[PDB]
Design a protein around this ligand. Structure first.
Ligand SMILES: [Zn+2]
Lengths: 397, 147, 397, 397, 397, 133
């Protein structure tokens, strides 16, 4: 695993530094690495593929060393090295696709393919080169039990969920109370409603609350908070809880009163913010607790006072909502986000070669089903496959 | 080229030139190591007489234009781990020979003609088989022929 | 072109590595490159500028080599090198602005300025250094006909378009049917409507469809799909098709029934997703085909049943919409996106020096007009200018 | 300051390049740097912490050099170097937290902690290594008075603001005119309204305008402009100006007529765009001036003509809005954005160790209060602390 | 790939030049090539076939050199060389059929069979001989990004299409107007009709237009234009648009008035021709725009005037048509034509060995389906297979 | 006219026969033709174009001979010959376009451009190669 990154690092540098006309002292230490790759790899033989429609290929290495005697590199020296690099870079593609496609349930952090088990001998350890990427540095710190961290831009921490809750209801569905929400990606939009507009509430104030637990602990997040849910603002018809009938929701929107956002960790309040919108921070949390309340306005112009009567026909329903959005955070387990394409490389290999459903991952690599039940057996497999997908992205985009 | 010296384990079908050929990625030398091992006679009849003949590139002196390049190529090899005293004595001893290109192109041009002309007067077949005893060559006589 | 990147790479490293007090072995291989720049460049003379208001400057190189004899670098050695770097970094600015401003129609991939044609001789090829950036690596892989790829964050693949389509209409404009859409940037918001709410449709179901073709083939995309068009949710008045009269649209919103999203490639279905919202992937596609339908709810409470009568006056119009958004994808041609500023550097040079409209690019470098007719003659020019803009961004931000 | 980056650069490279089994020529120049760190640092002694709950620690350096005699590195050579790196990387954490927590008002660009003042002697200048990061390169260019630049993705340039303006009003609040806006993060949503729908305006056209001044000058921005404010599109009740009464706002939405966006610099028009939506550029500006107008439609179907009478009861109010959004721009001072987490590292240190409110920064590091009054005394402190937070992020995530 | 052409070139010349009785100096340089083939190929072993019903064969080379000592070649020298040529020419057939049958979607320009991947090593590069054919010269110019060109005789550039368009219609189908066309192969026959014969048109002139876009850009074409569509000249019955009913078309034919043919390139008029029939040229185009109009004759003899009344029963319908035909043109991508049989060799191999449908090519190698969606992924595969089919045609007809 | 075909015949064969890895005896007679082109063409100078929108270009030939000492051609020998062929093949394009564009009425079979009149001297007749088209 450490020597699979070390093969790809000095094939990336060999296509970049060994160019025509360059001075020899620019590449004087790469060629000592590239010649010492070849000496270790000669005489061995490998075999990749076999699962699904992934074809079986056999690999055999018998190459010669590079020359170490020029002052400026010429077109003979480049063209005799390109037909050696192009055989290794085809070998690393078929080892990385052989490993992203396999999985185990007992110990997923171990190598699973036949070729990567064979590269983990002490014979092949002399190919080891620097480990400077983000995923190979966190592969080594976490293997010694030291603290790691991945930096994300808009991480997919919330599974998809769109539902509601009725705290007061009747079969006519004309005097209701409760909340509605959408949790999707890295964004929460909750909105509380009350059809009577707190005409009989004590002190004309109705209290709402919405608690979102996370799956993993986030660290040093940057969060944007805005006092409107724009998705629950228009008239719509909504089905019932069991799909029997439908009910109508015609909102008018007040401002949210007495907003309190809390950031919990094992039930302890780490941060809190009271009527403070814009950008906020959250240093360590795993549970977000939103709290906001509706207050009936005590003074109303004649255009407003017609909307909220005392009797039963309520044609304009009051609505109070919020909107939260995580911009960037630092987690310790691997996730998906909006910047890098490591999830897209894993699913595209499995979909292309028609791979059967195994014992660990959900069918079709569904991210909503995978972050919902994000077991420690799935975490060790998901890190092992995102790290191999990161190695393949250096050579083959 | 700084490579490790090899062991042969005296048994294989592969001569040391044949192993040292796919081991070296140099154009100038491996063009020469590929001629020298697949350099053999050609078995074909004229007029009822089977005779053994050679390539075109030895019948003219054209192959010596590669022996130049290959020997000259390594006359600049910095020779790592070698003492510079013994290094300069062997890099100059190769330029005793590589600087004589026009006189060795014509020497193998004459050697092939005298072999060609005198084999017109052969009547029996030129049957090739390893002789039990052996006429002996000294490489002192070859250095005396070249220089 | 390859030697223009190689000038900028070792002037960036010369301002970073040649600092005061550093050890000599840290910079022992850069100085051998920087001295070998100077030997190649002396005695030559150049000329940049001339088009628009870009002034004409003459360049002449007569410099001395750097010293290679200290153990730790001192302030004499730094200050005698800064007054050599500052002349080269002024030369590279005026060659990069001379090339981003010119264009051709026959073969746009060739150099166009007078200075960059002169740098493409074999005399100047010994200045060549490593080619490790993203755009100079894809310049070399694509020049040998090998497969390339650019990674984007929210790529501007859709031209701006906001229109509608009426599948049923009359001059009164009170019983309508059709779709509305906005395609802008990397986001599609389509919404289908029906004023009668499928009272006379067979099985009370109305079918909608919206097909978006792309200009270039995208690969391994990460796509977010949400079941509401929030832009077509409020009451508005819309003009007619020929601008004669105006018509009114008062929506209420049901949920989208039986959603199917397909990802086509040469008419072949690569991926498909049926009633699956959240984050999805798309491994290889060039056409997105959205399909969704409206179904009249069979059971309605008395608050809902007043909205949808049987007769002609329909005051509340039914609406069903979707929302699609591409987060990140990998294309093979150059595009614009939301992360990097290569399009902004090209237009800012042309606007500053008052450059006339040439034969290839649209007037004012309009991206909506350029991705609409994205010919292969414009693709070769756009890659040649984004690559020069990437070289200039290393030295001068 | 320059030698604090140089300590962290060669401790990051020491954990990456000194691995087991690697060839010695790969690390032959790092060990000459790492041994020359140790020679300079021995015999000295330091002291960090003391403010807030940050504990006081004493540091003392007495270490031995590394061996320079192997061909391939073995597990003795790695394990004898890891117990030297782990003492230095603990020292750099406590110097970086000692500097992010302190501030001054006279000259904030000078070092404030006791340890960083001691590292600024000429004895410690031989530890200096390459300065290749973005923040340490802009630390050095700006220290010599040369032009710098930071590249941002969605920069937090606007403070949070949500308000309105009534150009025509009466205590009944039934015939109003004016604009509403939200400025938050990097997004402007302005919307103008008119209850009479220009029935008595000259030529039935009502003119709106909204001018947003910036705090710092942005350069080469990429801006998305869309012709709808989706936040001011639904019915809501709004309080009065002094919080006395409430007033009702029931919108219908026309399209914006005759849109002009201008980009000012010292009162001079740099760029202008007239009825051009989608993606636009802005090369140099510090003031955005939006202009748009409402026009009554001259032809109306019978469904539209009922909405806008001639008399006083106006139940459907006209609304025209825009939406602007900055995707990426280049500023010269430091800011916050949506990609990097340098603001989150500064506040998380101050919140964890219970640090009292000093003379410069707002209480709680409120970004809305800090970009509102962004004085040159706060700019020098904010750059000095974001640069230290960038050094700490290399070693400890 | 370059060495597969070089095997077939010197086996074609070996059967032609090594004949009985010829002088030795005629073949003195071929034998040095043919002996140097054998030295490179000995000791290796190969394997072809495996897909479909193509059988698996194993290849092994152990041959002796040819004699270089005769003056005139005799029947011993010919018959000892024919039993060496006949083994190589059987090997090249099974490598060429192994490559025409395989395809890939990622990078189709790379070799796909197992034998051709093995021939692309630097060991086999010394077999390289001259590259003088048309397809191997364009294989090498296009591999370095230089401009190529293929010369065709009647190229199959148009997919098959036969349809119509009604600009004026009613369910009785007795007063119609529109165009009819056939696009097939390299020939366009368009014909416009009008049942009323422009009795109520302004100035008794009816305008027609027909626009044909191409798939690839053609260069220096020779085009024949004739003023009659002979296919739409006889009475026929035609179905409706949806296959519901049938309608009758009884033509009489006038001459086409005011003919204008335009040759477009990115919307720019390259060439134009106005009332000029016969042979014309077209130097650079990718869109053909035909324009022609019907004019009612102002003077009519009594035999003509009965045909065109003023009232509704029109029993003789007016018809105006054109005919265009491309004789020869130069394209840059590969196509099919009427002279060479490279498309017929590819399909005959796939049909004979019962090859399953792969991911790229249409089922059955349908040329109408392949030129309709002629993607750049299909272009790289189609050139790679036509080039292998051109190599096989030298040895085996 | 006969020497304009002879320039194009041995530039077509030079891009086809001078490939990487080929044996030297395959190209042993082409290089004697290609070196003997260069010796005749050095020191001369030409001028094409001028009519219509055809631009005026000046041509000048100062090149070195090719090596005749390898056994198999390598990538140094190919890449040093491609940057000589690419200058001649640009020269022949602008002489052929200069001649297809001009015409005369007295004797049209004579050369009309300035460059093709200059190539019809007996100095340039040694470039003559086979005439097989
Ligand atoms: Zn983003």
């Amino acid at each position: 695993m450490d020597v699979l990154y070390s093969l790809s690092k000095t094939l990336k540098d060999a296509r970049d530094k060994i160019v025509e006309g360059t001075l020899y002292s620019n590449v004087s230490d790469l060629i000592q690495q590239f010649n010492q790759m070849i000496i270790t790899m000669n005489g061995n033989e490998f075999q990749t593929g076999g699962i699904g429609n992934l074809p079986i290929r056999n690999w055999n290495f018998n190459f010669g060393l590079l020359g170490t005697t020029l002052l400026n590199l010429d077109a003979n020296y480049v063209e005799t090295a390109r037909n050696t690099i192009d055989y290794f870079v085809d070998f690393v593609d078929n080892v990385c696709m052989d490993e992203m496609v396999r999985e185990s349930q007992r110990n997923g952090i171990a190598p699973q393919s036949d070729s990567l088990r064979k590269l983990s001998a002490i014979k092949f350890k002399r190919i080891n080169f620097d480990n400077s990427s983000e995923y190979i540095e966190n592969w080594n710190l976490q293997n010694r039990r030291q603290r790691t961290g991945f930096t994300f831009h808009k991480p997919n921490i919330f599974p998809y969920s769109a539902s509601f809750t009725l705290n007061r209801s009747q079969p006519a569905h004309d005097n209701l109370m409760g909340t509605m929400w959408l949790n999707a990606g890295s964004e929460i939009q909750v909105a509380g409603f009350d059809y009577s507009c707190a005409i009989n509430a004590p002190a004309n104030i109705q209290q709402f609350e919405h608690i979102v637990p996370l799956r993993r602990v986030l660290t040093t997040a940057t969060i944007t908070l805005l006092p409107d849910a724009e998705r629950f603002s228009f008239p719509r018809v909504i089905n019932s809880a069991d799909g029997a009938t439908t009910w109508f929701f015609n909102p008018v929107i007040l401002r949210p009163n007495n907003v309190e956002v809390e950031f919990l960790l094992n039930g302890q309040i780490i941060n809190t913010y009271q009527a403070r919108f814009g950008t906020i921070v959250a240093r360590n949390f795993d549970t977000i607790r939103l709290s906001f309340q509706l207050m009936r306005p005590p003074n109303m112009t004649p255009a407003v006072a017609v909307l909220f009567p005392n009797a039963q026909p309520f044609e304009h329903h009051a609505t109070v909502g919020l909107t939260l959005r995580i911009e960037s955070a630092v987690c310790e387990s691997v996730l998906a986000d909006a910047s890098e394409t490591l999830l897209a490389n894993v699913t595209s290999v499995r979909q292309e070669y028609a791979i059967p459903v195994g014992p660990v991952f959900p069918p079709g690599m569904n991210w909503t089903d995978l972050i919902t039940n994000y077991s420690p057996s799935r975490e060790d497999n998901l890190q092992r496959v995102f790290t191999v997908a990161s190695i393949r992205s250096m050579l083959i985009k | 080229f700084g490579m490790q010296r090899m062991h042969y384990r005296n048994g294989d079908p592969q001569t040391p030139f044949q192993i040292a050929e796919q081991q070296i990625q140099n154009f100038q030398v491996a063009n020469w190591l590929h001629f020298v091992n697949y350099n053999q006679f050609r078995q074909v009849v004229i007029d009822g007489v089977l005779n053994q003949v050679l390539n075109d590139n030895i019948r003219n002196g054209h192959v010596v234009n590669q022996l130049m390049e290959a020997l000259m190529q390594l006359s600049r090899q910095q020779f790592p781990t070698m003492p510079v005293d013994y290094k300069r004595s062997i890099q100059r001893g190769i330029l005793l020979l590589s600087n004589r290109l026009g006189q060795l192109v014509d020497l193998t041009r004459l050697l092939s003609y005298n072999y060609e002309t005198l084999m017109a007067c052969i009547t029996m077949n030129m049957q090739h088989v390893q002789t039990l005893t052996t006429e002996k060559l000294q490489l002192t006589s070859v250095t005396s022929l070249c220089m």
